[PDB]
């Protein structure tokens, strides 16, 4: 079997992407944030503290004839940005673009942090990292991908994120019409539960390519590109007037500047991020200082190839017994 679903940016800056997902019987359609950096499928629900819901569509298990409460199971998650949520667990039927999984663990939020309440466009998250990171206790639960793997034509899913435009998540097949040239595959380490890989270097604009190993994770759930301080300093040094701002919390640049592209290495291949992808607009309404899409990972502890990098490529998440990541230009 296969599945295919359109994913859409939630705002004019591509801060995140939402994908419709059908849950329950009859279907309840929620718009979820597909997150290859986490492994929990959790949703706003009828059980969520009422004051913590502000426009989101909620899952109501009491209206699904296939929902079953998973007795005694709870979940609690904290994300690298300080957001958090928690609740109890149902099993139900979950479908993504024609691809159906029965008995998927659907984690019902009882409490959500403020950053989720204020995001009216995101009804929950669909985790696509490895199931070892799932937070359900006392019995760990599998991700949607792990549950679907056996019935997929190929144990893969692909991310084709758009720049200020819709894109596609495909499950079980690789669309050879969606990219140019060849796909370059690279090894993945699952030891931390992430889609962790090693980039072979970088270049700034038309500058010379620097061969150097950058270990990081492919994370559709993170907006920006977080790289080591040496790399990030080399990039912003090429933008007149750019500086690191402690009060803002990252590199900013004059909104009148033109940004250079950023190239990152995948084996012997190169993925080029256009400079426009790195502009995230004024730091406040009406400001002439703009926020940069490439930031330092120093305070994080790990390098993150987020949406800024991934949307410049066609990305294959190969969940075979030896997992790999594939990158192609598009
Ligand atoms: N998108 C999920 C996510 C968020 C943060 C991190 C961090 F901070 F631990 F790297 C990993 C995964
Ligand atoms: N990396 C997972 C994640 C995704 C979205 C959010 C937001 F946007 F709701 F804050 C937080 C954390």
Active site residue 78: no
Q: Cα–Cα distance between 21 and 212 in angstroms, integer?
A: 40
Closest ligand relative to 195 C-alpha: 1
Active-site annotation holds for 4: no
| Other Cβ atoms within 10 Å of 150 Cβ, number | 8
**Active-site residue identified among 38, 39, 86, 199:** 199
Q: What share of the chain is helix, strand, coil (3-state, %, to 5)?
A: 10, 45, 45
**Selection from 288, 316, 298, 178 nearest residue 233 by Cα:** 298
- The three-state secondary structure class of 99 is strand
CA 236 distance to own-chain centroid: 25
> Does 56 contact ligand 1 (Cβ within 6 A)?
no
CA atoms within 13 A on the CB side of 51: 1
Q: How was this structure determined?
A: X-ray
3-class state of residue 158 by DSSP: strand
- Dihedral sign from CA coordinates of 241, 244, 246, 252: positive
Helical H runs in the chain? 114-117, 144-148, 229-236, 307-310
CA of 88 relative to ligand 2 center, distance in Å = 20
Residue 84 CA: which ligand is closest? 2
Residue whose CA lies nearest to ligand 1 atom number 2: 37
The residue assigned the tokens 């080591």 is: 228
Q: How far away, in angstroms, is 36 Cα from ligand 2 center? A: 12
Residue 109, Cβ neighbours under 10 Å: how many?
A: 27
Tokens of 128: 């696509």
DSSP codes of every residue in 207-262: SPPEEEEEEEEE-TT--SEEE-HHHHHHHHTTSTT-EEETTTTEEEEETTSPPPPE
Closest-approaching ligand to the CA atom of 112: 2
Pocket test of ligand 1: the residue of 32, 38, 128 to mutate, having most ligand atoms within 8 Å of its CB, is: 38
**Residue 72 burial class via C-beta count within 10 angstroms: exposed 0-12, middle 13-18, buried 19 and up:** exposed
38: Cβ below 6 Å to ligand 1? yes
CB neighbours of 85 closer than 8 A, spacing ≥ 6?
Answer: 42, 76, 77, 109, 111, 112, 113, 116
Contact (Cβ atoms closer than 8 angstroms) between residue 157 and residue 195 = no
For atom 5 of ligand 1, which residue has the closest CA? 80
- From the CB of 125, is ligand 1 less than 6 Å away? no
Domain ranges of the chain: 5-174, 175-330
Q: Residues of 1-39 as b/e, b for ≥16 C-beta within 10 angstroms?
A: ebbbbebebbeeebebbbbbbbbbeeebebbbbbbbbbb
Q: What is the resolution of this structure in A?
A: 1.8
């Amino acid at each position: 079997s296969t599945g295919s679903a359109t994913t859409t940016p939630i705002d004019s800056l591509d801060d995140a992407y939402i994908t419709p997902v059908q849950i329950g019987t009859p279907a309840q359609t929620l718009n979820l944030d597909f997150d290859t950096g986490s492994s929990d499928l959790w949703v706003f629900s009828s059980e969520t503290t009422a004051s913590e819901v502000d426009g989101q569509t909620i899952y109501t298990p009491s209206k699904s004839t296939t929902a079953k409460l998973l007795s005694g199971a709870t979940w609690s998650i904290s994300y690298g940005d300080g957001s958090s949520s928690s609740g109890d667990v149902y099993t139900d039927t979950v479908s993504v673009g024609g691809l159906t999984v029965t008995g998927q663990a659907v984690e019902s939020a009882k409490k959500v942090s403020s950053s989720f309440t204020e995001d009216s466009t995101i009804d929950g998250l669909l985790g696509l990292a490895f199931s070892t990171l799932n937070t359900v206790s006392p019995t760990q639960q599998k991700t949607f991908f792990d549950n679907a793997k056996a019935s997929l034509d190929s144990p893969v899913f692909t991310a084709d994120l758009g720049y200020h435009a819709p894109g596609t998540y495909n499950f079980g097949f690789i669309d050879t019409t969606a990219y140019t040239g060849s796909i370059t595959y690279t090894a993945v380490s699952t030891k931390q539960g992430f889609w962790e890989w090693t980039s072979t270097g970088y270049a700034v604009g038309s500058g010379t390519f620097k061969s150097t190993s950058i270990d990081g994770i492919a994370d559709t759930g993170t907006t920006l590109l977080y790289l080591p301080a040496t790399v990030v300093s080399a990039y912003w040094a090429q933008v007149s007037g750019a500086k690191s701002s402690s009060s803002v919390g990252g590199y900013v640049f004059p909104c009148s500047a033109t940004l250079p592209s950023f190239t990152f290495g995948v084996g012997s291949a190169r993925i080029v991020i256009p400079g426009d992808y790195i502009d995230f607009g004024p730091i406040s309404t009406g400001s002439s200082s703009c926020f940069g899409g490439i930031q330092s990972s120093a305070g994080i502890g790990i390098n993150i190839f987020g949406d800024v990098a991934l949307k410049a490529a066609f990305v294959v998440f190969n969940g075979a017994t030896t997992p790999t990541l594939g990158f192609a230009s598009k």
